[PDB]
Amino acid sequence: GDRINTVRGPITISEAGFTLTHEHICGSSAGFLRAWPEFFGSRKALAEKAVRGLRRARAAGVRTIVDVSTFDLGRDVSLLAEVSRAADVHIVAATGLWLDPPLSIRLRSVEELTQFFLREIQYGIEDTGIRAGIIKVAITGKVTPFQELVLRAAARASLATGVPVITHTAASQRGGEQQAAIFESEGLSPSRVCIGHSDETDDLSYLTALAARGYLIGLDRIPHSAIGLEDNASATALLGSRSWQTRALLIKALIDQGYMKQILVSNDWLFGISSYVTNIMDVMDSVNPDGMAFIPLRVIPFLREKGIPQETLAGITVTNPARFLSPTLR
Amino acid sequence: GDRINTVRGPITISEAGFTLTHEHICGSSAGFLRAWPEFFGSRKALAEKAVRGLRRARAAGVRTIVDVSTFDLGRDVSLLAEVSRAADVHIVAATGLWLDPPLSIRLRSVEELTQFFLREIQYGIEDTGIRAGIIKVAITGKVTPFQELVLRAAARASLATGVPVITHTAASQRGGEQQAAIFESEGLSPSRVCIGHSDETDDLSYLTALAARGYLIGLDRIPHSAIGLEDNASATALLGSRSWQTRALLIKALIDQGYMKQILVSNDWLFGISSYVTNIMDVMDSVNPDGMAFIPLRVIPFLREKGIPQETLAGITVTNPARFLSPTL
Numbered sequence A: 001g002d003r004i005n006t007v008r009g010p011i012t013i014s015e016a017g018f019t020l021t022h023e024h025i026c027g028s029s030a031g032f033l034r035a036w037p038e039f040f041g042s043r044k045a046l047a048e049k050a051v052r053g054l055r056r057a058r059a060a061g062v063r064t065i066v067d068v069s070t071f072d073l074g075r076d077v078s079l080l081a082e083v084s085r086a087a088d089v090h091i092v093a094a095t096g097l098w099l100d101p102p103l104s105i106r107l108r109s110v111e112e113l114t115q116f117f118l119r120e121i122q123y124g125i126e127d128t129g130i131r132a133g134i135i136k137v138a139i140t141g142k143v144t145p146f147q148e149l150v151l152r153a154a155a156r157a158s159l160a161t162g163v164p165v166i167t168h169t170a171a172s173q174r175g176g177e178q179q180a181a182i183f184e185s186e187g188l189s190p191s192r193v194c195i196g197h198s199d200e201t202d203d204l205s206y207l208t209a210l211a212a213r214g215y216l217i218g219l220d221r222i223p224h225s226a227i228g229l230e231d232n233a234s235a236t237a238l239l240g241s242r243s244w245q246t247r248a249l250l251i252k253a254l255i256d257q258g259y260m261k262q263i264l265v266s267n268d269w270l271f272g273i274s275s276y277v278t279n280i281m282d283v284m285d286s287v288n289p290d291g292m293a294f295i296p297l298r299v300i301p302f303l304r305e306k307g308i309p310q311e312t313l314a315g316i317t318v319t320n321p322a323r324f325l326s327p328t329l330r
Numbered sequence B: 001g002d003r004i005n006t007v008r009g010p011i012t013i014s015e016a017g018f019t020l021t022h023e024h025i026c027g028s029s030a031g032f033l034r035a036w037p038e039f040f041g042s043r044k045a046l047a048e049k050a051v052r053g054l055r056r057a058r059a060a061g062v063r064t065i066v067d068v069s070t071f072d073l074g075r076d077v078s079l080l081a082e083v084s085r086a087a088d089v090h091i092v093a094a095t096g097l098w099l100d101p102p103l104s105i106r107l108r109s110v111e112e113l114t115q116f117f118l119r120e121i122q123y124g125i126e127d128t129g130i131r132a133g134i135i136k137v138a139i140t141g142k143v144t145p146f147q148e149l150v151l152r153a154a155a156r157a158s159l160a161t162g163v164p165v166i167t168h169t170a171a172s173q174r175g176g177e178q179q180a181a182i183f184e185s186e187g188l189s190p191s192r193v194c195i196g197h198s199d200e201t202d203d204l205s206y207l208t209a210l211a212a213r214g215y216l217i218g219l220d221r222i223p224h225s226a227i228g229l230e231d232n233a234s235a236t237a238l239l240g241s242r243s244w245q246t247r248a249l250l251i252k253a254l255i256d257q258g259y260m261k262q263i264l265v266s267n268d269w270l271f272g273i274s275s276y277v278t279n280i281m282d283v284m285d286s287v288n289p290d291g292m293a294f295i296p297l298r299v300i301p302f303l304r305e306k307g308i309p310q311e312t313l314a315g316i317t318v319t320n321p322a323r324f325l326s327p328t329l
């Protein structure tokens, strides 16, 4: 209603403050952090880096992050709770599915996946009593048959709980349209849906069209634009070629179209990553040493220079996430 | 050298007794049992079912099972420890990889995979201090590039620690020769390798030639048969269309060729399954109500009736697994 579930329990809407709506403590795989913590140096080393990173974001104004790591991204909510306490930053946990479901998940029906997402929202994650405050889904291309199952289960869990849905759009193929078609077929309100990674395209008319329909637009990979690395071929399939200012101008463009209320902004950062080639974390930290503080330290000042008023920036970073996350069936 | 790691700690090879070398408490995926236990009704219900089944096996003479569930098969070694203790049956845990590695595993180098396998053998699984006593690997058809990394890491781990390797092939497949090539290229002794699910075909030429090279032959899916379940595409794809007697006759055939010392026998049973279609566990329990007791209760006397001496059967069910499991550098 007016309360959001975090890994430290419920908080009221006003407590959320400046919120980054798409982040990760660790990008991994189910079971991996507990089976092979030394991959990250140690669990303690990962925890400590994440606490410093969160404290840095906090000093830059951030009060809440949404960790949209799912089961199959190796989400460890006990780790989230630990670093949230030590850094005094709220963390909202996620249910849903990313792009690496194991057999025990890939073989499930839409009704089974609905029950899974529901248990993580209504009951808790694993045996921790920590409840998810968001549902995350991922698609590739035009949306695969299994991904459509996931999208429908997500819609149904959202409809039962009021908790919103956030998507990973991995396509050069105006990937939102097919997502929206499926969500709407299920009776889900666009206002419960963020179409994420929308800063991956320059297709403004496409983004504006979604915004006009009531979808939230996730401009949430701003620092992955990067710059400089064409020597590592596996650094263009995780970063990019456009500049971060180019991505950030999409924020101004949507504002100018009159859809400031539809925008969510984030870094899609993390403090550890195992679901990619070894040492990619070091490359990422080199390119973006600001980490999760990139949005408040770089993008916000950049927008202010481009004439975006304080109140509009506060609306995007405080009010929109608050309205989005607050569980709602209207 | 004479001590085997179990989920309750070290045991002497004399204490292992009648050993089933290829079994599962639960066939699942990494993290799945702890994220969604109510898929199995509850964790408590799964544990209770495993203990009832293990106790029936114990009654039938079974003293040790080897749970060859890997990380990616959802191995929960805390569950293994709980049901081992309650059933009072030794359970040897596994490291290695099966057919569902996640990205964080699929993208690793042969050196990294070797370190992971060594961790689970030398240090312990997760934070439990429970050490693996066997390395499990799996292939599908022609060994994929990634599967070849897994096989080489398994060989390197086995050579460093002396614990044996056990392999999977898919339903009705014959990949031992492919696997053996890679293992031997790493300098691994065939006596440290069990070519598993070798009862999937009746290619006796294939079986005897591996045996002649010193490989253990895993005739380990004996009760798996979908005879009478022809309308069920999922069951038949899983269990196959060959009778348990047909599978069991391969044990006799290899004995008759003089290879009794190379034979390992098991059920490849499990008490919960999430890594396949829903409610497949109920179908399998209907097929084989004996569960893991199927080998001592049905296969052993079947072979007795075919004239195999009791001492040969004891050699296969006790001595062979002991020689196999005992760490040898």
Ligand SMILES: C[As](C)(=O)[O-]
Pocket: B024, B027, B168, B268
């Ligand atoms: C769990 As199996 C059928 O790969 O031995």
Ligand SMILES: [Zn+2]
Pocket: A168, A169, A197
């Ligand atoms: Zn994403």
Ligand SMILES: [Zn+2]
Pocket: A022, A023, A024, A068, A268
């Ligand atoms: Zn992400």
Ligand SMILES: [Zn+2]
Pocket: B168, B169, B197
């Ligand atoms: Zn197998």
Ligand SMILES: [Zn+2]
Pocket: B022, B023, B024, B068, B268
């Ligand atoms: Zn098996």
